[PDB]
Copies of this chain bind each other. A is one copy, B any other.
Amino acid sequence: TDKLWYILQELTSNRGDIQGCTIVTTQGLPITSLLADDANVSLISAMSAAIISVAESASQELQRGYLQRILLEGELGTIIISKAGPHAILVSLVDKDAKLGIILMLIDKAIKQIAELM
């Protein structure tokens, strides 16, 4: 759990554009988190897991293959939910005006590391 949180530290602080992060089980249980005290870790975890289930089915049926990552771009912020091996998911809360390419690079690196640790 410690090295996971340090992966999250790396990811989060490479730029102030990543608002927060959490590593969660595939079925919505938070493993570790780097989030504001006020944030709702449990709801973020459960919603991300549910979205991943739905998007997994849709990805496979939409000829896209196995789901790797899904971005939800809202008017106030972005949520990037990435598969980090078959046992974990990485949820990244991202500023609306963030540079998407940099963040996707950082998330790729963090995913590789997390999947390694699992």
Contact = CB atoms under 8 A, between A and B. Distances in A.
A35 B32 CA distance: 42
Contacts of A101: 101
Given A51-B54, A54-B51, A55-B51, A68 B61 contact: no
B74 A67 contact: yes
B72 A59 contact: yes
A64 interface: yes
Interface stretch (A1-9, A10-18, A76-84): A76-84
B51 A79 contact: no
Interface of A: 43-44, 47, 50-51, 54-55, 58-79, 93, 100-101
